[PDB]
Every structure is written in structure tokens, then in C-alpha cells.
């Protein structure tokens, strides 16, 4: 599903993401925007290390979800990677909350460091009534 911006903002709000581990909704929105363009079907295969990034948050198959074909997989979210390609993002959100309970928090996604850290990210939630 490709979410519309404010549609995704209200869905994340409902799912308890605003201020989760100190992270604002605008920061989660900046992350999904640059990771997938708000597209739940996004996958990215990383040929160098043989892992794949899945879904709207581009969560990786080595550390977080299991797809059966990644060497060294840990499956810290205890989730099949296919659960992250659903139109319903409740599972992608529970796994994304697991990723940020690690010390690094949202910095785990390098795309957030490149495009969102120390930038004004409030335009991602402006006008969504969130």
C-alpha cells in the first residue's frame, strides 16, 4: 500500500509511536519517507552482505526479521519478514519499536542520520491534525 502522508501520520499516532522512546512522530515520518516513500511493499536486497530490507521502515533481515535466506540472522523481532510487506503496518510498528529499544535508537537507520537528524522535520506532520 502507498500511504498518503497525513494518513500515515494518524495511523502511527494511533499505534503509539508519538514520543515512543523519546522519538517524535515527525521523526518517524521523516524515516518512512526516506526509507520507502511510505510504501509497505518496498524491499531492498543488499548484495554485499546478503540481507534484505523490508517494508515501510526498511527493516533488515539479519538483525530483526527472519526470511530464511540471510546468513547470521538473529530475528530479534521474532517475526517473519513477510509480516513487514502487509498493508496493515501494526507488525512493522511493533518491530520498529523493538529496534529503538536498543541504545542507538532511531540512529540505527543511517537514512535518518543522512536526511532527518538536525533538520527541521516538522513539515512531515504539518496539517495532518496530529
Distance CA 73, CA 31 (A): 23
Q: Answer whether 92's CB lies under 8 Å from 8's CB.
A: no
Instruction: Determine the Cα–Cα distance for residues 118 and 99; give it in Å rounded to an integer.
Output: 21
Per the annotation, the verdict on 53 as an active-site residue is yes
Measure Cα distances from 107 to 28, 36, 88, 100 in Å: 11, 17, 25, 8
Query: Which of 7, 18, 49, 53 does the annotation list as catalytic?
Result: 53
| Experimental method reported for this structure | X-ray
Domain range holding 29? Answer: 1-130
Tally of structural domains, the chain: 1
Candidate list 35, 67, 102, 120, residue with the active-site label: 35
Q: Are 5 and 13 in contact (CB under 8 A)?
A: no
Give kind and range of the element (H or E) at residue 53: strand 51-54
C-alpha cell at position 20? 515512543
Query: Contact at 8 Å (CB) between 66 and 29?
Result: no
Distances (CA, A) of 46 to 31, 51, 57, 58, 123: 19, 5, 15, 12, 31
Please name the residue that has the C-alpha cell 511493533: 94
Measured distance CA(54)–CA(11) in Å, rounded: 19
Identify whether 4 is a catalytic site residue.
no
Amino acid at each position: 500500500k502507498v500511504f498518503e502522508r497525513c494518513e500515515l501520520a494518524r495511523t502511527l499516532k494511533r499505534l503509539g509511536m508519538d514520543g515512543y522512546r523519546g522519538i517524535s512522530l515527525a521523526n518517524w515520518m521523516c524515516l518512512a519517507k526516506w526509507e520507502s516513500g511510505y510504501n509497505t511493499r518496498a524491499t531492498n536486497y543488499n548484495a554485499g552482505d546478503r540481507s534484505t530490507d523490508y517494508g515501510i521502515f526498511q527493516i533488515n533481515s539479519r538483525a530483526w526479521c527472519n526470511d530464511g535466506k540471510t546468513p547470521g540472522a538473529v530475528n530479534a523481532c521474532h517475526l517473519s519478514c513477510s509480516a513487514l510487506l502487509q498493508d496493515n503496518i501494526a507488525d512493522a510498528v511493533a518491530c520498529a519499536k523493538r529496534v529503538v529499544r536498543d541504545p542507538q535508537g532511531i540512529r540505527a537507520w543511517v537514512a535518518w542520520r543522512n536526511r532527518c537528524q538536525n533538520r527541521d522535520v516538522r513539515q512531515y506532520v504539518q496539517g495532518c491534525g496530529v
